[PDB]
Design an enzyme around this catalytic site. Structure first.
Site, PDB file in Angstrom:
ATOM      1  N   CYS A   1       6.242  -5.122   8.584  1.00 60.00           N
ATOM      2  CA  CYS A   1       6.461  -5.923   7.387  1.00 60.00           C
ATOM      3  C   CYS A   1       7.423  -5.180   6.474  1.00 60.00           C
ATOM      4  O   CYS A   1       7.270  -3.974   6.258  1.00 60.00           O
ATOM      5  CB  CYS A   1       5.145  -6.207   6.654  1.00 60.00           C
ATOM      6  SG  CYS A   1       5.310  -7.277   5.202  1.00 60.00           S
TER       7      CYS A   1
ATOM      8  N   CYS B   1       8.099  -6.427   3.279  1.00 62.22           N
ATOM      9  CA  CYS B   1       7.871  -6.925   1.927  1.00 62.22           C
ATOM     10  C   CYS B   1       6.657  -6.330   1.229  1.00 62.22           C
ATOM     11  O   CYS B   1       6.743  -5.999   0.047  1.00 62.22           O
ATOM     12  CB  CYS B   1       7.716  -8.451   1.949  1.00 62.22           C
ATOM     13  SG  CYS B   1       9.134  -9.364   2.592  1.00 62.22           S
TER      14      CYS B   1
ATOM     15  N   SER C   1       2.107  -1.929  32.488  1.00 61.74           N
ATOM     16  CA  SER C   1       1.224  -1.462  33.545  1.00 61.74           C
ATOM     17  C   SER C   1       1.380   0.040  33.760  1.00 61.74           C
ATOM     18  O   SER C   1       2.391   0.647  33.396  1.00 61.74           O
ATOM     19  CB  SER C   1       1.504  -2.206  34.854  1.00 61.74           C
ATOM     20  OG  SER C   1       2.730  -1.785  35.429  1.00 61.74           O
TER      21      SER C   1
ATOM     22  N   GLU D   1      13.568  -4.602  -8.353  1.00 61.91           N
ATOM     23  CA  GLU D   1      14.314  -3.468  -7.820  1.00 61.91           C
ATOM     24  C   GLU D   1      13.786  -2.112  -8.268  1.00 61.91           C
ATOM     25  O   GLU D   1      14.136  -1.101  -7.649  1.00 61.91           O
ATOM     26  CB  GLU D   1      15.789  -3.568  -8.226  1.00 61.91           C
ATOM     27  CG  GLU D   1      16.512  -4.805  -7.729  1.00 61.91           C
ATOM     28  CD  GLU D   1      17.977  -4.809  -8.122  1.00 61.91           C
ATOM     29  OE1 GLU D   1      18.277  -5.085  -9.304  1.00 61.91           O
ATOM     30  OE2 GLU D   1      18.829  -4.534  -7.252  1.00 61.91           O
TER      31      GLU D   1
END
Ligand SMILES: Cc1cc2nc3c(=O)[nH]c(=O)nc-3n(C[C@H](O)[C@H](O)[C@H](O)COP(=O)(O)OP(=O)(O)OC[C@H]3O[C@@H](n4cnc5c(N)ncnc54)[C@H](O)[C@@H]3O)c2cc1C
Ligand SMILES: O=C(c1ccc(OCCN2CCCCC2)cc1)c1c(-c2ccc(O)cc2)sc2cc(O)ccc12
Ligand SMILES: O=C(c1ccc(OCCN2CCCCC2)cc1)c1c(-c2ccc(O)cc2)sc2cc(O)ccc12
Ligand SMILES: Nc1nc2c(c(=O)[nH]1)N[C@H]1C(S)=C(S)[C@@H](COP(=O)(O)O)O[C@H]1N2
Ligand SMILES: Nc1nc2c(c(=O)[nH]1)N[C@H]1C(S)=C(S)[C@@H](COP(=O)(O)O)O[C@H]1N2
Ligand code: MOS
Ligand code: MOS
Ligand code: FES
Ligand code: FES
Lengths: 1295, 99, 50, 50
Positions: free
Chosen positions: A146, A148, A319, A1231
Site C-alpha cells: 500500500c 497510501c 513448488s 505534503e
C-alpha cells in the site's frame, strides 16, 4: 480438444478451444467483467491481484483454500478448481462481508486500489484460521503493498478478528460461520470420478498438456524433452513476461500423488517436488516441534528462510521442485540444501535415479544435472548428528518480500572427542550466476579448531575463492564482499556459543558486548495510539467520517479508469520507448510490425506532423522523438492494434538502429562540468553572510547527496479516449491530477477549440504528483490515434514502462558552508542546491524555487545566502512529487545542523533548539511568522515520547552492545503552504438542488485517495443543514466546472471547499424567505416551494484564491498563506554486521488547525511519513553507466511494506487554534509529513555514530540510507580486510 | 440549457443568442446536448415557448459574463476572446455563469 | 441525484414523447437495476402506435 | 453522422426489452403463462405487475 471447466465466485465457467496463453487476471477483468482484481506490477510482488483458489482432494475428502496472485495463473491450470475474488465474498447489493466492512470503516483505504488484494489476503487467512493470531494476519499481508495508508489502519482491522477511537468497533457485523461460501458441489462430483485422462489445449502458438497420472507425465517428459513442467509458474511466468522467453509446449500436471509425498524416515525427511513452499513451511514447523534439536538442524535453517521468502501468495504457488530446478542465483533455500547432503529422486521411462544436490548440479553441469526426459519426484533432507550445526543468513533491501543481495548456508561437523573440524560446507547465493560453494577453503580448514585464528584464516581463504569482479552484475560489490565474511563471523559466534554450552571446559565464553550479534532484528508487535479533539450533532465538520468510497474500495465496486467497460470496437495503444540515453535514431523499421495480426497503425514523429510539439511552460517540446533520443524511456513509436496482446507483440518487432552521442551526462557533477551555457539563477539573501564569517568561532564545509523516488501509485497510467462522432467532439477519461491540462493538450494536438474536448475523472488510484505532464503527452498521442481512425482508444501502461516513462522525484546535491559559535548558533550559512532534472527542465525550476523558500525549516539563520540550479542530464525527466522540493531542501539543512552538532560536542537536538525560530520571528524572504505552535509541537513531542529517558537507555544499550546499536533522533517541521499567485489558487464548484430535496455537487478537485470529495460533502452538509446522505457527487469534469487549477499543492480541499461553501451560501440566501415561512419543513418542501415561486436552485461557487506574491529579484514577498508545524521522534536498532535495521518507535505531533476530518487527516500524516521513510532509507533507483534503469533481481524497487512500519507509532494533533483565513480554520496536511520520515534517517545516523565513536573513527551519510551504506559506515576488521578494485579499471554495474 | 432539440432548431437559435450577446461568431460557440446533470429542474419542452424562455436564460448568463468582463474589455478593446478569457483567469474572474 | 437523463436530439416528437416514454423508461430502468445490465428499448412502428 | 438514441453504440453486455401488450379493450386477465417464453433462447427475465 478438451473443454476448460472451473468456477468463479460460485458460477460455472466453460471455455471452448481456449487459448492456453490466457492468464487469470485479464480473463477476470475483460471476459467475466469482474474488475475488482487489479493490475499492480505483474510480477507477483505487490498483491493487488490476490485471489483465493479452492480445490477438493477426493482421496482425503478435504477442501483446501490458498491465496494466489492472478497475474501469474494460466487459466488452463484451473480445471476443476474454484476461484474467489473480492466480488465473490460480498457487495453493496447483497451483503457486506465483515472483512470488507472493517477495512473500510477502520479507514484502511485511501485511494482504494490495493484494497481488494488486502481483502482477499485477509479473507483467505480467515477461511483457514477462523480464530487467528495477529502474526498470522500480518504474515498473510507480507506480500500486499500500500502506498497510501502506512498500514496501521489495516492492522487495526486485522486486530478486531483476534481478541477516543476513530471507529466504532462494537458496531461491526460478527463473523458468521453459516454465511461462508460453499465449495461448488459439481467440482466435488468431478473429483470423485477420479479421471485418468490427460487434458489437452492448444492454439496456433502453443500446445498445453495436463497429465493427471505419473505414467502420463513421464510420457510427455520423454516426447517433449525441452518443454517446461509448470507448477506455480513463479519462475517461468516472469521470465516469459519480462525476458522475451517463449515456450511452444507446456506440461502442467494436476495433483500427482507421487509428487506430494511426505515420508518421515529413520535417517531423514523426504519431501515431494509438488509440495508448495507454504506446505513445506508447515511440514517443517511440525517436525521441529516433535523432534529434538539435535536432529532438526537443517529444518530450522530452512524454516528461517521460508519465513522471509516473498509473500504468502507466492509461497502458496511456488513448488519445492520448481525452486530447486529453477536454480535462481538469489535462491534462499538452495544454499541451505547445498550444505546438507541432500539427494534428488529422479524418474523417467527408463526408471529411477538418485543424484546429489551439490555445486555441480546448481551450476547446471550436464554431468550432475537431470536428463532431458527426467522429472524430479522428491528430495531427501537428512537429520543432523550430534556436534553438527547448520545456519542460514541473508541480507536484502527489506526484511521481507525482497530478493537477497547475499545469502548463505553453512554446516560444520565436529569430532566427539577432539573438537576438531571434521566436515565443513559453506555456500553463498547472490554472488554469481549460480549458487557457489567454497569447497577449497573448507577443505583447507578441515582438521583445525573453532577459534580466532581459524576464523582469520577462513576469511582470507573465503575471500580469495568466492571472488567478485568490480563489474559483477547486481553491483554492491564491496557490500557483497563484506557480507560474505560477516556471515562467516556470525556462524563463528553461533557455533562458538553452542560449543561453550555443550562443552564448558574446553571453550571460552562470549564477551558480553558480542552476544547480541546472534539476535536478529525481528518484531511483529505493531502497536499504535492516536490523539485528536472533539456545534449541533448533525454537523459532520470535525467528525471522523469514513471515505465516501471506502466500502466500494473494499468490494471492488469502485470504478477506476481501466475498470471501465469495453467500448464498442475500441483499440489499444502501446509505446516503443528509447533504449539509449543519448543517441541518434539512424533508422526505424516498421515493415514487420505493421504486417502482424491486429495491427491498425504505427505512428512516429513524422506522422504527427506539426502537432508533435506543445509549449508546456517556456518552450515547445516533442511528444515522439525525431532524429535523436536524450534518455531511455523517451517515446519513439506508438503502436495501435485491435488488442493489447497484439499491440505489445508488434511493438517488440519494431526495429530501431541507434548511434550513440557524446557527451553522456548522468550525474549532477557531470552536468555542471559539461555545461557552459547560461543558466537562470535563483537566490535568497538575508543579513550579511560575508561579514558574519569573520565573527564565528568555527567554519564547516559539507555536502550531501540525495537520490530520487518513484511515485509508485498503485494504479499505473490509464486512459480511455472516446470520439463522439459529431463535430470532432472528444471525451477523455484519464487518471490525472489536471483535467484542464489534458483538455488543452488534446485540443491543441487535434487543432480543436477547448469546447470540443472534455475530460472526466471520477477517481485516481494514487498520484502523488506523477499524473500530470506525461499523462497529457500520452493522452494527446492517444487522442490523435482515436481521431485518425474514428475509434475509441485505450492506453494503460505496465509497471515497467511506467517507471521508465514517467520519471520521479528530483535527486538533489546540497553544498553548505556554515559559520557557527561553539554553542551551536549558526550565524552564517552559505547554501547551494542542485537538482537532477533529467532530459527536460520543465518543472525543475519550480521545485528549486520552493526548495529555497522552504529550506529554513524551523530555524532562524540571521545571515543566510541560498542559491539553486536545475541540471539537465540524459535521464528520464523528473516531475513534481509530494513535498515539492521540501523533503530535499530540509534534509540538506538538517544534515548541516547535524554536522555542526558534531563539531560542538552537542546532540543534534540541542543545536536544533538553539537555532529554532522564536515565537514571533521573520523568514529569509521577510515574511512575519508566528512560531508558537512550532515550539509547542517540539515540547509536546518531547513529553509524549519520553525522549530524555529513552536517550539514556539508548546510550546504555550502545555501551553494552558492540555489533548492535540503537539510535534516536527528533526533527522539527515548518511546512509553509501557498502557491505562486492568487490565480493559481482559484477554485470553482457547481451545486444543484432537485425538487425532491436531494443535492448534486461537483468541483474542480480530483480524488486521489486524500478524501477531498468526502470533505466537500461534509461542507455541503453543514452549510445547507442537511445530512450527508442527501448529497451526492459523481466526479470531476471540464463540462461542469471549467478552468480548474491542478489538483496539488496541499490546497485542494482548502480551496474547493471555499468554492463549495460559496455556492451553498448563495442557495441558502435565495431560500431564506421560504425558510422563514416554513421553518419546520423538509428540503423537499423548500425546493418545491422555490420552484413554485420561480427561485433558481442551481448556483456556481467561486473562490478567487489566497493572496500570494514572491519577488525573486529582491528576494522578498508574502508567498505563503499559513504554515503547518510538527515534530517527529524516531528510534531504531541497526545490525552493524549486515546493515539491517528495525524501526522501533515513532512519535509525531502535528499542528493541523481545526481538522475537518481527523480520520482522513491522520491517515494523511501516516501515509506521508511512511512515504518519506522509504525516500530516506530503502527506496533506491539504480542506473547503469549507459543510463539504463536496472529493475531485476536485487535492483528491484522497494516501497515500505508492513515489516518496515514502526512497531510503535504514536500520533497526536496539536489542540486547535484560530485561522480565520482558511476554511473552518483548517490546514492542508497532504505534503507536510513526508519530511518527518527523515527522523528515521537521523536515528540511523545516530546509531552509526555510536559504533564509529566507540571504534575510534572521527561522517557524511547520503540518502537513501540503505543497508549497503549503513554496513560500510560501520567499519571493522571485515571492512578493512576485503579486496578493493582500482577505480577506473572496470565498468561498474551502477553509478 | 433545459430545452430539447426535436427538429425545431432551438439549439441553433441559442447559439445565435450567444453570438449576439457575447459579440463572437457562432463558430466560437458549441453545444453538446441537454442533461439534468448540468441544468436542473427544467420544464417540459413544449407549449411553443422553448426557444422563447431558454433564450432569455441564455441571454441572462451571457450578460452576467459580459458584466464581469467589462473592465477587461475596456483596457483592451481590440483584443480577442482568448486574450480576455486568459486575463480574466489571471485576475481571478469567474468564467462560468448560470442563466 | 442518483438518476441523470441525457438528451442530445429527438427525431420528431410533437408532444408524443412524454408520459408513455416515462413509463417505458421506468420499467426499463427497473430491469436494468435488477440485473446489473444496460437495457435498450426501441419500439416498432406498430406497437408504437398502439 | 447525427446520433439519435438508437444510433448509440452497443454498450458492453446490454440487454433488450420488449413489451407484451393487451389485445382486449375491456376485459379481466384470468391468467398469464410465462413457462414457455421463460425457457426460450436468450430470455433473461419476464416481468408482470406483481
Ligand atoms: C514475486 C516473487 C518473489 C520471490 N521471492 C523469492 C525470495 O525471496 N527468495 C527465493 O529464494 N525465491 C524467490 N522467488 C522465486 C521462487 O521461489 C521460485 O520462482 C519458485 O520456487 C519456483 O517454483 P515454481 O513452482 O513457481 O516453478 P515453475 O515456474 O513452475 O517452474 C520453474 C522451472 O522448474 C522446472 N520444474 C518444476 N517442477 C519440476 C519437476 N518436478 N521436474 C523437473 N523440472 C521441474 C520447470 O520445468 C521450470 O524449468 C520469488 C518469485 C517471485 C515471483
Ligand atoms: O584440545 C582442546 C583444547 C586444548 C587446550 C585448551 O586450552 C585452553 C587454554 N588454556 C587454559 C589453561 C592455561 C593454558 C591455556 C583448551 C582446549 C580442545 C578444544 C579446543 C578449543 C579451542 C581452541 O582454541 C583449541 C582447542 S575443543 C575440544 C573438544 C574435545 O572433545 C577435546 C579437546 C578439545
Ligand atoms: O499550471 C500550469 C501552467 C499554467 C500556466 C502556464 O503558462 C504558460 C504561458 N502561457 C502564456 C500564454 C497564455 C497561456 C499561458 C503554464 C503552465 C501547468 C501546466 C499546464 C497547464 C495548461 C497548459 O495548457 C499547459 C501546461 S503543466 C504543469 C505541471 C506542474 O507540475 C505544475 C503546473 C503545470
Ligand atoms: N492517498 C493519496 N494521498 C495523497 C496523494 C495521493 O495521490 N494519494 N497526493 C498527495 C499530494 S502530491 C497532494 S499535493 C495532496 C493534494 O490533495 P489535498 O490538497 O486535498 O491534500 O494530496 C496528497 N495526498
Ligand atoms: N421538427 C419539429 N418541429 C416541431 C416539433 C417537433 O417535434 N419537430 N414539435 C412541435 C411542438 S409540439 C412544440 S410545443 C414546439 C416546441 O418548440 P418551440 O417552443 O421552440 O416552438 O415545436 C413544434 N415543432
Ligand atoms: O503538490 Mo502534490 O500535486 S506534487
Ligand atoms: O405544446 Mo407541444 O409540447 S403538445
Ligand atoms: S502481484 Fe500481480 S499485479 Fe502485483
Ligand atoms: S489505499 Fe493502498 S495503495 Fe492507495
Amino acid at each position: 480438444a478438451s473443454e476448460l471447466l472451473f468456477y468463479v465466485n460460485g458460477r460455472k465457467v466453460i471455455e471452448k478451444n481456449v487459448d492456453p496463453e490466457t492468464m487469470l487476471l485479464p480473463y477476470l477483468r475483460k471476459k467475466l467483467r469482474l474488475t475488482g482484481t487489479k493490475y499492480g506490477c505483474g510480477g507477483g510482488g505487490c498483491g493487488a491481484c490476490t485471489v483465493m483458489i479452492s480445490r477438493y482432494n477426493p482421496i482425503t475428502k478435504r477442501i483446501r483454500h490458498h491465496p494466489a496472485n492472478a497475474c501469474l495463473i494460466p487459466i488452463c491450470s484451473l480445471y476443476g478448481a474454484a476461484v474467489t475474488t473480492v466480488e465473490g465474498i460480498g457487495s453493496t447489493h447483497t451483503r457486506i462481508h465483515p472483512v470488507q466492512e472493517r477495512i473500510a470503516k477502520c479507514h484502511g483505504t485511501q485511494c482504494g486500489f490495493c484494497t481488494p488484494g488486502m481483502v482477499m489476503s485477509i479473507y483467505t487467512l480467515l477461511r483457514n484460521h477462523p480464530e487467528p493470531t495477529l502474526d498470522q494476519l500480518t504474515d498473510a499481508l507480507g506480500g500486499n503493498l500500500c502506498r497510501c495508508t502506512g498500514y496501521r489502519p489495516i492492522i487495526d482491522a486485522c486486530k478486531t478478528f483476534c481478541k477516543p477511537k476513530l471507529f466504532a468497533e462494537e458496531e461491526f457485523l460478527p463473523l458468521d460461520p453459516t454465511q461462508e461460501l460453499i465449495f461448488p458441489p459439481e467440482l466435488m462430483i468431478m473429483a470423485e470420478k477420479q479421471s485418468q485422462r490427460t487434458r489437452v489445449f492448444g492454439s496456433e502458438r502453443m500446445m498445453w498438456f495436463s497429465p493427471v497420472t505419473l505414467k502420463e507425465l513421464l510420457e510427455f517428459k520423454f516426447k517433449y524433452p525441452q518443454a517446461p513442467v509448470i507448477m506455480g509458474n513463479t519462475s517461468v511466468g516472469p521470465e516469459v513476461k519480462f525476458k522475451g522467453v517463449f515456450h511452444p509446449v507446456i506440461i502442467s500436471p494436476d495433483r500427482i500423488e507421487e509428487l506430494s509425498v511426505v515420508n518421515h524416515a529413520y535417517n531423514g525427511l523426504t519431501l515431494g517436488a509438488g509440495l508448495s513452499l507454504a506446505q513445506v513451511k508447515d511440514i517443517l514447523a511440525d517436525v521441529v516441534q516433535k523432534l529434538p534439536e539435535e536432529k532438526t538442524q537443517m529444518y530450522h535453517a530452512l524454516l528461517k528462510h521460508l519465513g522471509t521468502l516473498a509473500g504468502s501468495q507466492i509461497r502458496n504457488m511456488a513448488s519445492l521442485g520448481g525452486h530447486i530446478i529453477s536454480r535462481h542465483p538469489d535462491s534462499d533455500l538452495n544454499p541451505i540444501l547445498a550444505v546438507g547432503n541432500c539427494t534428488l529422486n529422479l524418474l523417467s521411462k527408463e526408471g529411477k535415479r538418485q543424484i546429489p544436490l551439490n555445486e555441480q548440479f546448481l551450476s547446471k553441469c550436464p554431468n550432475a544435472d537431470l536428463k532431458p526426459q527426467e522429472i524430479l519426484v522428491s528430495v531427501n533432507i537428512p537429520y543432523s548428528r550430534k556436534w553438527e550445526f547448520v545456519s542460514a543468513f541473508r541480507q536484502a533491501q527489506r526484511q521481507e518480500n525482497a530478493l537477497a543481495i547475499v545469502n548463505s548456508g553453512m554446516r560444520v561437523f565436529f569430532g566427539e572427542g577432539d573438537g576438531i573440524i571434521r566436515e565443513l560446507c559453506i555456500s553463498y547465493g547472490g554472488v554469481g550466476p549460480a549458487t557457489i560453494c567454497a569447497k577449497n577453503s573448507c577443505q583447507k580448514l578441515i582438521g583445525r579448531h573453532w577459534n580466532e585464528q581459524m576464523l582469520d584464516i577462513a576469511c582470507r581463504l573465503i575471500l580469495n575463492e568466492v571472488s567478485l569482479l568490480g563489474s559483477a552484475p547486481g553491483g554492491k560489490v564491496e557490500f557483497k564482499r563484506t557480507l560474505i565474511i560477516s556471515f562467516l563471523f556470525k556462524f563463528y559466534l553461533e557455533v562458538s556459543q553452542i560449543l561453550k554450552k555443550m562443552d564448558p571446559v574446553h571453550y571460552p565464553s562470549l564477551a558480553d558486548k558480542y552476544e547480541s550479534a546472534l539476535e536478529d532484528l525481528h518484531s511483529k508487535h505493531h502497536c499504535s495510539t492516536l490523539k485528536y479533539q472533539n456545534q449541533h450533532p448533525e454537523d459532520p465538520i470535525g467528525h471522523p467520517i469514513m471515505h465516501l468510497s471506502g466500502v466500494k474500495h473494499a468490494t471492488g465496486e469502485a470504478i477506476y479508469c481501466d475498470d471501465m467497460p469495453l467500448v464498442d470496437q475500441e483499440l489499444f495503444l502501446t509505446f516503443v520507448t528509447s533504449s539509449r540515453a543519448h543517441a541518434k535514431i539512424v533508422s526505424i523499421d516498421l515493415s514487420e510490425a505493421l504486417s502482424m495480426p491486429g495491427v491498425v497503425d504505427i505512428m512516429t514523429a513524422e506522422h504527427l506532423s506539426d502537432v508533435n510539439s506543445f509549449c508546456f511552460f517556456t518552450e515547445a517540446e516533442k511528444f515522439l522523438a525525431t532524429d535523436k533520443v536524450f534518455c531511455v524511456g523517451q517515446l519513439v513509436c506508438a503502436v495501435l492494434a485491435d488488442s493489447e496482446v497484439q499491440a505489445k507483440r508488434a511493438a517488440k518487432r519494431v526495429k530501431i538502429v541507434y548511434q550513440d552521442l557524446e557527451p553522456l551526462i548522468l550525474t549532477i557533477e557531470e552536468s555542471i562540468q559539461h555545461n557552459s551555457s547560461f543558466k537562470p539563477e535563483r537566490k535568497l539573501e538575508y543579513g550579511n553572510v560575508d561579514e558574519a564569517f569573520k565573527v564565528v568561532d568555527q567554519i564547516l564545509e559539507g555536502e550531501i547527496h540525495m537520490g530520487g523516488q518513484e511515485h509508485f501509485y498503485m494504479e499505473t497510467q490509464s486512459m480511455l479516449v472516446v470520439p463522439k462522432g459529431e463535430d470532432q467532439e472528444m471525451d477523455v477519461y484519464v487518471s490525472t491530477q489536471f483535467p484542464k491540462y489534458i483538455q488543452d493538450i488534446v485540443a491543441s494536438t487535434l487543432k480543436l477549440p477547448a469546447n470540443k474536448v472534455m475530460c472526466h475523472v471520477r477517481r485516481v488510484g494514487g498520484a502523488f504528483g506523477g499524473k500530470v505532464l506525461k499523462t497529457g503527452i500520452i493522452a494527446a498521442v492517444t487522442a490523435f490515434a482515436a481521431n485518425k481512425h474514428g475509434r475509441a482508444v485505450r492506453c494503460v501502461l505496465e509497471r515497467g514502462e511506467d517507471m521508465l516513462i514517467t520519471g520521479g522525484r528530483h535527486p538533489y546535491l546540497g553544498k553548505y558552508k556554515a559559520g557557527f559559535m561553539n554553542d551551536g548558533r549558526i550565524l552564517a550559512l552559505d547554501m547551494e542546491h542542485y537538482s537532477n532534472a533529467g532530459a527536460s527542465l520543465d518543472e525543475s525550476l519550480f521545485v528549486i524555487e520552493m526548495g529555497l523558500l522552504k529550506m529554513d525549516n524551523a530555524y532562524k539563520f540571521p545571515n543566510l545566502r541560498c542559491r539553486g540550479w536545475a541540471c539537465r542530464t540524459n535521464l528520464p525527466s523528473n516531475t513534481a512529487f509530494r513535498g515539492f522540493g521540501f523533503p530535499q531542501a530540509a534534509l540538506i539543512t538538517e544534515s548541516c545542523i547535524t554536522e555542526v552538532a558534531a563539531k560542538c560536542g552537542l546532540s543534534p537536538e540541542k543545536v536544533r533548539i538553539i537555532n529554532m525560530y522564536k515565537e514571533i520571528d521573520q523568514t529569509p524572504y521577510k515574511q512575519e511568522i508566528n512560531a508558537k505552535n512550532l515550539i509547542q509541537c517540539w515540547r509536546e513531542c518531547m513529553a509524549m515520547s519520553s525522549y530524555s529517558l529513552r536517550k539514556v537507555a539508548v546510550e546504555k544499550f550502545n555501551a553494552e552492545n558492540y555489533w548492535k546499536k540503537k539510535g534516536l533522533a527528533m526533527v522539527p517541521l515548518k511546512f509553509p503552504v501557498g502557491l505562486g499567485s492568487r490565480a493559481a489558487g482559484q477554485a470553482a464548484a457547481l451545486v444543484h438542488i432537485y425538487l425532491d430535496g436531494s443535492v448534486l455537487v461537483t468541483h474542480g478537485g480530483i480524488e486521489m485517495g486524500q478524501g477531498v470529495h468526502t470533505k466537500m460533502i461534509q461542507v455541503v452538509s453543514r452549510e445547507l443543514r442537511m445530512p450527508m446522505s442527501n448529497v451526492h457527487l459523481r466526479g470531476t469534469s471540464t463540462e461542469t466546472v471549467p478552468n480548474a487549477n491542478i489538483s496539488g499543492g496541499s490546497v485542494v480541499a482548502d480551496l474547493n471547499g471555499l468554492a463549495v461553501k460559496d455556492a451553498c451560501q448563495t442557495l441558502l440566501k435565495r431560500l431564506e424567505p421560504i425558510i422563514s415561512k416554513n421553518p419546520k419543513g423538509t428540503w423537499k418542501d423548500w425546493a418545491q416551494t422555490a420552484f413554485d415561486e420561480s427561485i433558481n436552485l442551481s448556483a456556481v461557487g467561486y473562490f478567487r484564491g489566497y493572496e500570494s506574491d514572491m519577488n525573486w529579484e529582491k528576494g522578498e514577498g508574502q508567498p505563503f498563506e499559513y504554515f503547518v508545524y510538527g515534530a517527529a521522534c524516531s528510534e531504531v536498532e541497526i545490525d552493524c554486521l549486515t546493515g539491517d535495521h528495525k524501526n522501533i518507535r515513532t512519535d509525531i505531533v502535528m499542528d493541523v488547525g481545526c481538522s475537518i476530518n481527523p480520520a482522513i487527516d491522520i491517515g494523511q500524516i501516516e501515509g506521508a511519513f511512511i512515504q518519506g521513510m522509504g525516500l530516506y532509507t530503502i527506496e533506491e533507483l539504480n542506473y547503469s553507466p549507459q543510463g539504463i534503469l536496472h529493475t531485476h533481481g536485487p535492483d528491484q524497487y522497494k516501497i515500505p511494506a508492513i515489516c518496515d512500519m514502526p512497531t510503535e507509532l504514536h500520533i497526536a494533533l496539536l489542540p486547535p487554534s484560530q485561522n480565520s483565513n482558511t476554511l473552518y480554520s483548517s490546514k492542508g496536511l497532504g505534503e507536510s509529513g513526508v519530511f518527518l520520515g527523515c527522523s528515521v534517517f537521523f536515528a540511523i545516523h545516530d546509531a552509526v555514530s555510536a559504533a564509529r565513536q566507540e571504534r575510534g573513527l572521527h561522517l557524511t551519510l547520503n540518502s537513501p540510507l540503505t543497508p549497503e551504506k549503513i554496513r560500510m559506515a560501520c567499519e571493522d576488521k571485515f571492512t578493512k580486510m576485503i579486496p578493493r578494485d582500482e577505480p577506473g579499471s572496470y565498468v561498474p554495474w551502477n553509478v
